[PDB]
Amino acid sequence: AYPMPNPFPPFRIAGNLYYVGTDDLASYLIVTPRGNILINSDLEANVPMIKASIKKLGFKFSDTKILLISHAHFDHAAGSELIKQQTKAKYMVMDEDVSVILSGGKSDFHYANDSSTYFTQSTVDKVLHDGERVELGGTVLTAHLTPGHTRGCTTWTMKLKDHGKQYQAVIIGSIGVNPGYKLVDNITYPKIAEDYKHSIKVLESMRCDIFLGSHAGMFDLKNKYVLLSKGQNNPFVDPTGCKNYIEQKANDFYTELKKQETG
């Protein structure tokens, strides 16, 4: 079973982007004059935690206008129906992952026959596409299709002003190869390996100043938060860590491909 995350103190990352997630499953709040955008609903058990984090920062849960996700797996999206019920936020999802969201996991190319991965069915209010913007109150997020991990895995980007300076924030959706994924002659998702390769090409050439992700461990949340509490100049500005993480995951993909082809 998925390890239950622990609470994590919410904080401002940069500009109008806040962390409202856990010590593992990462969620983000973008605060605008016309309401807020929430990224990742996490597990059903985490929805009260997200609400509490939002309110701890002095914001209103009822001001959540838009709900986005990194990708259509239960650990990022299971809480979405509850959030929609409690806030009436509009749920927007990349085209290629909509089937999984509508089916609560039953159409997943890999986990269709693993009921431990299923989650509450919901409807999608707006279907997104590669390069499409999500705009609220002058804030502009861009959805980048970085497929492989899921068919519609989304890497979210935005530009943030921090201490008078401009930074591109990148929330890496995931380019991990899960244990058991088949990369050669995949029966349900034949383009899986081509998709990962495309994601690698996109991410390797992407400007990345503020390095974030769907999981805390991708981007060193805990150690960076400690630096932030100590008053360090934005430790979440980490272009070198971003470059190195993308390169590591690209290498991990090719390592797994080598194992499947030659091992």
- Residues forming contacts to Zn ion in the complex (CB under 5 A) are 73, 75
The verdict on whether residue 163 carries a ligand-binding annotation is: no
Nearest to 179 by CA among 256, 126, 89: 256
Which residue, 73 or 144, has its beta carbon nearer to Zn ion? 73
Which residue, 16 or 80, has its beta carbon nearer to Zn ion? 80
Q: What is the Cα–Cα distance from 49 to 145, expressed in whole angstroms?
A: 28
Which residue, 35 or 176, has its beta carbon nearer to Zn ion? 176
Residue nearest Zn ion, Cβ-based: 73
The encoded tokens of residue 253 equal: 């993909």
Taking the complex as a whole, the smallest distance from the CB of residue 128 to Zn ion amounts, in Å, to 18
Beta strands across the sheet bearing 90-94: 11-14, 17-19, 28-32, 35-39, 64-68, 90-94, 126-128
Which residue, 65 or 151, has its beta carbon nearer to Zn ion? 151
Taking the complex as a whole, the smallest distance from the CB of residue 75 to Zn ion amounts, in Å, to 4
The verdict on whether residue 144 carries a ligand-binding annotation is: no
The verdict on whether residue 73 carries a ligand-binding annotation is: yes
Which residue, 73 or 224, has its beta carbon nearer to Zn ion? 73
* Exposed / middle / buried, residue 5 (Cβ in 10 Å: 0-12, 13-18, 19+): buried
- Are 75 and 43 contacting, i.e. CB atoms less than 8 angstroms apart? yes
Taking the complex as a whole, the smallest distance from the CB of residue 55 to Zn ion amounts, in Å, to 25
Indicate left, alpha or beta for 155 from its phi (over 0: left) and psi (-120 to 50: alpha). beta
* Exposed / middle / buried, residue 139 (Cβ in 10 Å: 0-12, 13-18, 19+): buried
Taking the complex as a whole, the smallest distance from the CB of residue 11 to Zn ion amounts, in Å, to 21
Taking the complex as a whole, the smallest distance from the CB of residue 179 to Zn ion amounts, in Å, to 12
Q: Would you list which residues are annotated within the binding site for Zn(2+)?
A: 71, 73, 75-76, 149, 215
Q: Would you list which residues are annotated within the binding site?
A: 71, 73, 75-76, 149, 215
